[PDB]
Design a protein around this ligand. Structure first.
Ligand SMILES: NC(=O)c1ccc[n+]([C@@H]2O[C@H](COP(=O)([O-])OP(=O)(O)OC[C@H]3O[C@@H](n4cnc5c(N)ncnc54)[C@H](O)[C@@H]3O)[C@@H](O)[C@H]2O)c1
Ligand SMILES: NC(=O)c1ccc[n+]([C@@H]2O[C@H](COP(=O)([O-])OP(=O)(O)OC[C@H]3O[C@@H](n4cnc5c(N)ncnc54)[C@H](O)[C@@H]3O)[C@@H](O)[C@H]2O)c1
Lengths: 236, 236
């Protein structure tokens, strides 16, 4: 029960799969990323800038003009990426900068967009990390970025957060996704423990059409063992 | 047991009290803030910029030149500030931008500085928020900022985070501090539930000189009831 979806990070591995999948069902899908998705119904290009407010104002304004008075069924915030490094790393700063822009910036704008354009009873999905439920000594930036997302998910389920009535804010907490990039970069790893993209797509679909949707403010761990994926709630 | 301290946010309410207090004991104290602290032994001025890596590289380089081969007993990261707003707020973006720069940026550089300049058995203090242990619907940015700090504290206590041997990473989680600004801005509030600055200063002093120091990765709630402050551990 949905025909209007926004995919934030629409050109990423997951995001791309979503656009394709929803377009195949004849849903109207807009992709919001640093580059265009010609497969989407519409594309919003995020401006590359160090200025958060400049980027945010730009996306908000453009989505505003694109939607008009139309509300969407869901906003899938699937933007992110990974970078490692401990506190001593020479690349700490560069990596932190990137991690913040990919996960914190996107999560924040998404949240704002949800308050303005999500239908009542609609869905917002955020991208967290199972690893970020604890200290992440070998990946400072990433852990911090994802931790903040987790926290934000809590805020949105609270009274007077600005979320539309009956809408839900849900964070997905994966370990590793099965992507060609992951495959090339971790060639001798056990792919049988990586989550297929299709599994998430099918899950999102369920959540949208009212099937098995968890409460707002839920942190859902996505863990794959021997090619079988399971969903397990985690508490903040 | 200390004579060398760095205060990050050295010109803030708390930070200022620290510099004064440690200088009074004849300790060498450097203040790192957006403005100079003429009361400190030394002052490092953070460059105002939207570029995280530009700001970070600048502080790191300058602290490096200032310290040389000298290690410090402690780094008190007391930088922050507060801004409110739900997800629907028109000022969300502006407020988020500020919250991130004051708490996330500072916490991150501080952490990096600790790995390079903290003595073994030294201390790093971070500034969190009791409120950020849950969803903060009325203060998105703040909650996110402080949540990330909490998470980072966890990372630094982990194996191979880059922290010097025996040093500790401790986050302080206040409710409200007794500041003249708070007083002017919340005039009919119960000041008897606000934490005196001196209490934190005395606490920091204890932590530095080895008295009653909690484990690394500790989240210490600071709660004042009827002018009596108490320290209570919280778990991530
Ligand atoms: N792949 C994994 O192993 C793994 C493990 C845990 C979590 N995750 C997460 O799940 C989500 C989906 O992962 P993925 O594998 O599809 O990621 P991806 O790297 O393949 O795709 C992320 C997308 O985000 C876009 N993006 C980055 N910053 C952006 C901004 N400011 N505005 C707009 N778009 C921006 C990128 O351009 C890219 O298209 C991400 O948050 C990712 O971190 C992935
Ligand atoms: N005052 C309260 O009621 C209250 C409640 C909870 C937490 N806290 C926190 O405890 C810590 C001490 O609080 P305070 O009352 O002394 O804060 P403050 O606002 O009075 O001082 C913070 C300082 O941080 C500096 N700063 C901000 N961004 C900076 C950057 N990028 N580089 C350097 N310096 C930067 C500011 O210039 C200011 O001097 C802060 O993290 C604050 O958020 C305060």
């Amino acid at each position: 029960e949905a025909r209007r979806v926004l995919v934030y990070g629409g050109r990423g591995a997951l995001g791309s799969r979503c656009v394709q999948a929803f377009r195949a069902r004849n849903w109207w899908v807009a992709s919001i990323d640093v580059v265009e998705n010609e497969e989407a119904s519409a594309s919003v290009i995020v401006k590359m800038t160090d200025s958060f407010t400049e980027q945010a104002d730009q996306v908000t304004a453009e989505v505003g003009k694109l939607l008009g008075d139309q509300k969407v069924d869901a906003i899938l915030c699937v933007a992110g990426g990974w970078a490692g490094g401990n506190a001593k790393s020479k690349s700490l700063f560069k990596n932190c900068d990137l991690m913040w822009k990919q996960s914190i910036w996107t999560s924040t704008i998404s949240s704002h967009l949800a308050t303005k354009h999500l239908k009542e009873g609609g869905l917002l999905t955020l991208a967290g990390a199972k690893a970020a439920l604890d200290g992440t000594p070998g990946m400072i930036g990433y852990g911090m970025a994802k931790g903040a997302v987790h926290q934000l998910c809590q805020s949105l389920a609270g009274k007077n957060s600005g979320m539309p009535s009956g809408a839900a804010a849900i964070a997905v907490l994966p370990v590793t996704l099965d992507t060609p990039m992951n495959r090339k970069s971790m060639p001798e790893a056990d792919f049988s423990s990586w989550t297929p993209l299709e599994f998430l797509v099918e899950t999102f679909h369920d959540w949208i059409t009212g099937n098995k949707r968890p409460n707002s403010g839920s942190l859902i761990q996505v863990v794959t063992t021997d090619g079988k994926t399971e969903l397990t709630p985690a508490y903040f």
